[PDB]
Design a protein around this ligand. Sequence first.
Ligand SMILES: [Zn+2]
Ligand SMILES: [Zn+2]
Lengths: 114, 134, 222, 331, 293
Amino acid sequence: VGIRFCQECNNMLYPKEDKENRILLYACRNCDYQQEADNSCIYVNKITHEVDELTQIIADVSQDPTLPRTEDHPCQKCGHKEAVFFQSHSARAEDAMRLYYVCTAPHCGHRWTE
Amino acid sequence: GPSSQNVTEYVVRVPKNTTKKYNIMAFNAADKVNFATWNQARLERDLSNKPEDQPWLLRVNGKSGRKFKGIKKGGVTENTSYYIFTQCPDGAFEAFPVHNWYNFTPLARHRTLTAEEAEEEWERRNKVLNHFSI
Amino acid sequence: AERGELDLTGAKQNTGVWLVKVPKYLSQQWAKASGRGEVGKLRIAKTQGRTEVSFTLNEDLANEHPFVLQSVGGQTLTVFTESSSDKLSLEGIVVQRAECRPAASENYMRLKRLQIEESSKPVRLSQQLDKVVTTNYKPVANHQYNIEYERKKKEDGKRARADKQHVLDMLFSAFEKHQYYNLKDLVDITKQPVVYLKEILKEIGVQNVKGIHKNTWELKPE
Amino acid sequence: FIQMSVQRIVEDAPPIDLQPPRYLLKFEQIYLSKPTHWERDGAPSPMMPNEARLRNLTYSAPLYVDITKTVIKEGEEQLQTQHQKTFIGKIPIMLRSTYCLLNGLTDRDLCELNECPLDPGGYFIINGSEKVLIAQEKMATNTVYVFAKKDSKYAYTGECRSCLENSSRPTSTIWVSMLARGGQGAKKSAIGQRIVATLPYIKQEVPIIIVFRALGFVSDRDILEHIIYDFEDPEMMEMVKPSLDEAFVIQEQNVALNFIGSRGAKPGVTKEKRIKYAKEVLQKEMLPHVGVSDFCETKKAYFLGYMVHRLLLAALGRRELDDRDHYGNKR
Amino acid sequence: DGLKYSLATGNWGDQKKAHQARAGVSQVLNRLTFASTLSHLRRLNSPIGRDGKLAKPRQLHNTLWGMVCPAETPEGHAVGLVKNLALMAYISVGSQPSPILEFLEEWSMENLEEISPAAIADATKIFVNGCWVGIHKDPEQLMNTLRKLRRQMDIIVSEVSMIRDIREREIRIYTDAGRICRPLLIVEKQKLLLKKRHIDQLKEREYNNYSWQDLVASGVVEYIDTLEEETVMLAMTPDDLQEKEVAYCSTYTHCEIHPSMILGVCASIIPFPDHNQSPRNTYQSAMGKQAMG
Ligand SMILES: [Zn+2]
Ligand SMILES: [Zn+2]
């Protein structure tokens, strides 16, 4: 899944297979350096698009004045009543209109979806 | 500790003129090159450019063994003057203005020659992908 | 002992040296150092909580700046010296980088004023003038025309058509020097009029295109 | 414009040298005068706007400049001349402007000149007629806007008009375009879409990796850091993966410069001429606003990386497309 | 010859080549009536041709609010292509970015070359006139200092805009000419920056010599660009919102000086325009120009 970078020349490594070893080895055209592939995964594709919007949003977003704030919904981690509510506004967010809440307390870094 | 307890005050002297120009040599942290390991270092103006405008070229253990090319800075004192402070036997600090800044970068390990032929070969590989319908 | 070779004694020593950023106004004051060259004294104070480095200006130089330390991590800094003779030596390796920034010693009016003082003169701008400066002048003759007229009287380009044999000898000398001589070059050589010179050239030579047109006179093979 | 821009345009002029004795001319201080009309006798009379309409006079102010002439005869002797207030031409003056006589005059003075205090002014007088310049809406220069068009073959196009203080007579536009995700060839689809970037004076679109190599940062990691600030997201790496595939071992900066030079609107038969043309086009025609000078090519690479980064965010859908209708975008 | 020729021709190009000459630049002033003369002097021309029927340029837009009068548009084959700027809205002359840049470098600005690529993600980018001069670790600290300096007017003119896109992680400051900025009253936690004491001083200009620039120097009113307006919260009525109620926001950054101010001179002459149909107001804007006076 992650890119592999050549230690010797800092260039991308392309996996190659040798029958005797039976282990995937990353190969560099520029240099002879080779290393085993623990992942052994050549390619990965996800059509799920299930990435959480909470990871995409950040704690600093709550500080914005324009965003509306609800005292009714408290922050679970620090028990702070004030919290900010906004739509996801992200790719593939048409299916879900779920509200996203970020704690307005500074440095709390707590984000939850309601 | 003892260093914190000790307080040292040293006079600073700036020479109006310096006989030898002071320049900065920079080595990449990732390269981790060691001055002690090098058998010798030779510094000359870059052959490809062939004065001060030409970048310094550093060869370590011969040009083939290692190549470093200095990167000239268009303005070194233009944003602010830079002064080199040197420890002295009296201990009074001496400040020297930096005439030029050079950053030395290691040459790519693979090296070799590309030229027009390499560009054509890469185009041919792209054409081979284009030729196949699938 | 070679100009091409770089001395590595400083690199082996790994002597500690400091790279310090100094403001241009402070640098100008430092450049005009008192006497032979003294700018003041530097006081170093170290405490468990923090380390403070400060420099005090000389009273004569004036007639305390805190230093902001900059991390050297992620870079390696060394000092190399180029002599007037081009001899190369290494002073040492920089251990710390610092910036001289005044704290609470400059007013907002100052520093902003200091930039104006550095500029010295405001940028030039269009200036409106009452009335109009005279645009009409009355010279008897143009200066360039008179300079040419004096030159024409002083020097006459060519002379008369005389001593054709002497001119022929000069043409032979040019032909000996080079197989083909440009007609304009020959006109500079001989004072014979271009038309008379062409007739003498025709007798001893034939103009040749050389495949580039622009026929150039050359001596006849016959 | 009259007080400062006219002076700046003459001040920002290269000296003209003709040679072999060389004569050098420099345009320095600009001098301006209150508008005057020349009679048949040749005696000047101050222009009056009401009178100008009656006689069909054009309201204009004389322009003067200081020219310094230095000539070298190749004998190591220089002759210096100081021409001052040399006539350049006449510039029409907008009514009620500080230069215009009507401004700075009391209402009683205006009544004597038969000029209404109520009249707004702000109109140039040409041939005794009233002409007022009309403001024109224009897209902002030195700004990056991303638009996705179905008609365009490229799925996403980003436009960055570039100029420094309108010094260039024609603004230069550089566009970074992401190819459509769908591929006619399955092999092309398997590698992925290629982000070819349009540049000024290029015969065909140049891939981002090739232009990045020409700027510098030959190492693949260096190109990647400008294109993506954070490598945490796999999908952005997958988008740039075909760009990495097209150029790998060919990291030579001069060869990349030759490749753009050969695929260019202007062709140089000698290899050095192609390199010179490619270097100059990258230095000035491409991203002039970031740096007029050759130095700061690394800053130009950072700005080019930002344009690619915005395109990657637009492909993700994380960043919404810019709107032409937005008034702030318009100038 | 060139300057005179271009103004008379109405085409903005050199005499030798008419290919690059612009269309509709410089038009004869209308002297039919005093109101028509003012309307002609303040005019905006769309880059798109009148023949083009594309809906998006012709259609009125949300960002146009406070910068143009919707009622004052000429009817014809092209609709909304010609617009008149709002009376409050002022086109910015523009200022050099070099003095602001000196403040920015002093105020914790880090150059791109020294900064690592990872650091660029960590610290919000700063663009001045669309140029990536530097990045700042804290967006709010730089923004607060810039805005307070703008009220003083010592370093930055009120016309200059300071957009703060925290979500985009970019800070944009524009001193370029051609921006349109409208003065807006600044609102604090529950009160207008403007006070009754300022109004009484303004009423007597005989000795006080109070001026609009004096209010700008006070910082009670600040010019806001359309891009800044996107990041600026606005209050439709100051007294009602300031009084405790279920307001949309209690921290509006700015307040409109007046709703009627957005309307153009042709729109203002019509009585009770809101009661009248919106197309009828547009028709009267054309009638006012051709009215005989
Ligand atoms: Zn490798
Ligand atoms: Zn919390």
